[PDB]
Amino acid sequence: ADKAFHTRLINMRRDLHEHPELSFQEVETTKKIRRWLEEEQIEILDVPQLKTGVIAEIKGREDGPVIAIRADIDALPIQEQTNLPFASKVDGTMHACGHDFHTASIIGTAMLLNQRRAELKGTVRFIFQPAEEIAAGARKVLEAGVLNGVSAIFGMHNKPDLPVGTIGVKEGPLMASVDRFEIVIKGKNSIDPIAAAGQIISGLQNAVVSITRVQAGTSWNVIPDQAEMEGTVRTFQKEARQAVPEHMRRVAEGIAAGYGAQAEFKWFPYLPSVQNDGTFLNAASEAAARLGYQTVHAEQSPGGEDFALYQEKIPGFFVWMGTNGTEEWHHPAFTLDEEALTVASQYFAELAVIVLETI
Template sequence: MSNELLEDLIGKRRYLHENPELAFEEFNTTAHIKKWLEAHNITILPLDLETGVVAEIKGAFAGPTIAIRSDIDALPIKEETQVPFKSKTDGKMHACGHDFHTVSILGAAILLNDQKDKLHGSVRFIFQAAEEIAQGAKIAVEKGALEGVSSIFGMHNKPDLPVGTIGVKSGGLMASVDKFKIKFNGVGGHAGIPHNAIDPIVIASQYVTSVQTIIARRLNLFDNAVISITSIHGGNTWNVIPDSVELEGTVRTFQPDARAAIPDLMKNLAESIAQGNGGSVEFIWDDYLPVVNNDANLEEIVRKTAADAGYNVVDGVPSAGGEDFAFYQTYIPGFFVWMGVNGPQEWHHPEYDLNEEAIKVASEYFAQLAVNVLSK
């Protein structure tokens, strides 16, 4: 990559950073991505997307179509960095590095466009909206973004890895994410006369402690899972037993069998405790995101591309965070890597930042990965 192109991409990243847009509000971001692609005569596919862009470079030779994906949305966070290009919109920030992802994959597209006469196949670029609310990938697939695509590749920046380091791991890299709501119903009454009531606070309290036995005693020792209850609401004064208590929380897993088993285990336990105390329960489960499950057949070429380019390849350490790249992997084989950016803070922190030299690494890596996959 030339210094001129790198400086151009850095400028584009800073523009996006100054002008963050939340999920499904990325109209300006979308318009600029289209303009930047069109400036290099890269074809934009006419998909019916309100926000987000899908583009494609067709090689001179016949071959498969692969995809490279970036997310483009920001977060509802007030930026606290001191960079001169900090967010101009109060309460919105690129605190997860999607501005970096966008220009890096744009850079890969520009590099590949310059060598399309050597490509054996096509490369599709998915600049996806609404990753932060786990809806963008679903809509992109519904609109045809994966039509004819044989495999897909993507990345997430990793602030705790140095620039030039790429984390690679087949299997589960980012956890499945599921949500639940539980309402324990009792019978309200006087706090001093509890025998005439059915106390849902007691029922809920038993459940909060007992539910952890599902992880400790009902799942396989080698399964990775966590159940976190993050919200409890019940009652509104000191001397009245309420009618109900509501709980909310999340479950994170890496193994499909564990993910499939946990909802019934949680529901059965809730019903048992509620009925044992004379109450009842309403249990709502939301299948939010599957696990980012990297295809083992792609690991060798992903690793070799990085190593041959002189990058430091390390084993990717799994994260219990979620990523809707996983949704694409339920349709076609895919591989998601960690890209080192040497940042001062973790994702979603108001002082999140990164080393912009990582743009060059990411752009060149994905351009070469596409060439290698299509030549295989």
């Protein structure tokens, strides 16, 4: 089962890529995943609270710890521009982030581990998670009790800039925290909230502050009472994430007071940083070594992944999967080399066996 198994992985990837679904709307995707696992008699867990998304489980022949392997299943509201034979048949929707690839790979992993139950010193729970793109699915999975009793969680993201056969590996911070902020500048010379707003932009913009919206006034003649701005903060360390809002507040409050105005600062947490546990570092390396694949030191990503929400609760490891792509995530012409389907399915199957040996 070499070429036959690979073609089976390719065909699943392409079926999903051809029929992409948006966050929380993955009805058919959920249906296909369920069917594909039941084909190989892999137990599917009953989680009625998850309308979309699939939870599966493979038990070893010994009692042991439970670990989890996660794939994301949702696509994006973007028109595909690849001109591939299996391109989205749904105009304006596309798997432009390779989640079709993640899904097919982890189904592969389940299929390989299904024939290797005697090697498993415990249980692997498979998580096919909806709504990664809106950072809402991981929270739904957690609240469904899917991670109760789970010791460790593992995941991947395709990395177009890395070659096939290469897995990106680092301990600690991999992907940035994402947080929303809003500042309203109003009075108490009538008032100058605009001048205040201008200095605060220059004052605010280890963390990266990105102001994305500024709105003050309606007409050229009338002096505005308010000025509002909003944006995101991105950090890599936990303390930086806890120290920047107060620093941003102090700056906004001080500048505004200089102009006879007052500042309202609002903070809305979105995502913690993807933080990799160093206890799995050795396992992540030896899994690639056993299969003759390569590892590189993972470069950090400015993006946020809701996989980080899992890692707030239990130890976890998230890796880059080299896919030799042409465009970055979310591009209309985004591609991936399907040879990585063998790499990724085998990698997580071997990682699961290795982790359960030592965990």
